[model samples]
Target: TWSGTKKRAQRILIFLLEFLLDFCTGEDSVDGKKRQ
Candidate 1:
């Protein structure tokens, strides 16, 4: 149960990141963006 929740949390975070890039900066390519 703990691990499942952790996984879901990480998944949500992934989506949050994707949304941030997609909507925040108008960038649709997640993997195409440069890393810091």
Candidate 2:
């Protein structure tokens, strides 16, 4: 059986992934969308 630490780690990893995706996808880009 997994411990609470494992569950917390999973949650943190997922959050980091989501944060990176959002950051890369321009969800919070400072320059906004680039000219096509």
Which number leads on TM-score? 2
lDDT values for all models: 0.74, 0.76
Q: What TM-score do all the candidates reach, one by one?
A: 0.46, 0.50
lDDT (tens digit, per residue) of candidate 2 on 1-36: 767868978999999999867867865665655453
Structure candidate 2, residue pairs in collision: none
Model 1 Cα lDDT, one tens digit per residue, 1-36: 457758878999999998877666755544566573
Model 2: what TM-score? 0.50
Q: Pick the candidate with the highest lDDT.
A: 2
- Model 2 is weakest, by summed lDDT over 10 consecutive residues, at 27-36
Q: Candidate 1: TM-score?
A: 0.46
Residue-level error in angstroms, candidate 2, position 6: 2.1
